[PDB]
Amino acid sequence: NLPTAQEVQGLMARYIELVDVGDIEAIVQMYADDATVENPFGQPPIHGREQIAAFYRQGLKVRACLTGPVRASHNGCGAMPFRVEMVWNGQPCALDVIDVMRFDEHGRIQTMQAYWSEVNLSV
Amino acid sequence: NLPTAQEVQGLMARYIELVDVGDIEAIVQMYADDATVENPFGQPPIHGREQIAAFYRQGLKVRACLTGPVRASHNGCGAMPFRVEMVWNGQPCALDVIDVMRFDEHGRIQTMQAYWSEVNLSV
Ligand SMILES: Oc1c(F)cccc1F
Ligand SMILES: Oc1c(F)cccc1F
């Protein structure tokens, strides 16, 4: 059901593990069927598992890891800081991100907001 | 005006510096006169500079520092991870937090959401 603070920590860490391996299908199954993603926050949301899948598939050798603990609330929400390492034209680079997520009463991500801009990118 | 991504980074870092010294009056002046604070996120908002001042004064020897970079957007918002160190009955302890902030068209914090629970506290 609606995850506890403890369960939020586990779910958000699991999310980063699945990014890190690049398991698109498993990432999509963490989202509600009609979830929204704003990535980066400030840009229009994308809606639904098909669009979210399209986003991860195009976005995702990528490494990703937590760069500090998951901060969880008691209302099925949390925020986490992490870093994603990638290649963008033979050039390695990294991006520092904070995701904010709200989970639904089934334990699926209902909304995700990914905070980052160009100021968080490093070559 | 509405801060740029760069200006958000500076403003959010300045906020942590002012927490760290414990300058209640300077912290309150960063907020809009009618700002809201949800701290921890999940709890009812407090509204306005008088209530916000009351919150910082009661909350704030405290140390506070960024534990990674400020993630800023292009719509006057950002998120940052940090740690606050304190004493709570002669016992030192620490709290890991992510704040999410939205700035107004004047550069003042209009809303702040502080993500953390008991799972982020350490004795
Ligand atoms: O959640 C994510 C990722 F998993 C990868 C890049 C950005 C982002 F916001
Ligand atoms: O913004 C803050 C602080 F400045 C201190 C403790 C918690 C918090 F959310």
> Mapped to the 3 state alphabet, what secondary structure does B53-95 carry?
HHHHHHHCCCEEEECCCCEECCCCEEEEEEEEEEECCCCEEEE
d(CA A38, CA A44): 6
Residues B115, A73: C-beta atoms closer than 8 Å: yes
Omega before residue A81 within 30° of 0, cis = no
CA atoms within 13 A on the CB side of A107: 13
Non-local CB neighbours of A68 within 8 Å, separated by 6+ positions: A80, A81, B67, B68, B81, B96
CA of A40 to the centre of ligand 1 (A): 9
d(CA B17, CA B22): 8
d(CA B86, CA B62): 5
B55 at A interface, C-beta within 8 A: no
DSSP A70: P
Non-local CB neighbours of B18 within 8 Å, separated by 6+ positions: B26, B27, B30
Pairing, β B109-115 against β B31-38: parallel
Contact A104, A76 (CB under 8 A): yes
Distance set, CA A95 to CA A36, A87, A116 (Å): 21, 11, 8
Q: What is the CATH number of the domain that holds A69?
A: 3.10.450.50
Angle, alpha carbons A112-B101-B104 (nearest 5°):
120
A117 at B interface, C-beta within 8 A: yes
Pairing, β B63-66 against β B71-72: unpaired
Give the bridge partners for A102, in sequence order: A77, A111
With beta carbons under 8 A apart, name residues in chain B contacting A6.
Answer: 119
Which residue bears the tokens 């304190």?
A: B86
CA of B59 to the centre of ligand 2 (A): 8
- Of B40, B67, B79, nearest to A115 by CB-CB distance is B79
Way the structure was solved: X-ray
Q: Residue A85, Cβ neighbours under 10 Å: how many?
A: 15
Q: Which domain holds residue B121?
A: 1-123
Q: Which long-range contacts (CB under 8 A, 24 or more apart) does B17-23 make?
A: B19/B60, B19/B62, B19/B64, B19/B84, B20/B62, B20/B63, B20/B64, B20/B65, B22/B60, B22/B62
Ligand 2 atom at minimal distance to the Cα of residue B114: 9
d(CA A84, CA B5): 20
CA atoms within 13 A on the CB side of A47: 1
Residue type, B52: I
CA atoms within 13 A on the CB side of B111: 9
**Resolution of the coordinates, Å:** 1.5
Would you state the structure tokens that stand for residue B13, as one six-digit string? 């870092």
d(CA B96, CA B19): 14
DSSP A8: H
Residues A120, B78: C-beta atoms closer than 8 Å: no
Which residue lies with its CA nearest to atom 5 of ligand 2?
B84
Please provide residue A42's backbone torsions phi and psi, each rounded to the nearest 5 degrees: 115, -20
DSSP, collapsed to helix, strand or coil, labels residue A3 as: coil
d(CA B110, CA B13): 16
Please give the tally of structural domains in chain A: 1
Omega before residue A69 within 30° of 0, cis = no
With beta carbons under 8 A apart, name residues in chain B contacting A97.
Answer: 71
Among A26, A36, A40, A47, which Cα is nearest to A84's? A40
Distance set, CA B13 to CA B81, B104, B106 (Å): 10, 17, 18
- Shortest CA distance from A44: residue in chain B: B75
Non-local CB neighbours of A31 within 8 Å, separated by 6+ positions: A37, A49, A52, A108, A109, A110, A112
CA atoms within 13 A on the CB side of B1: 3
CA of A80 to the centre of ligand 2 (A): 16
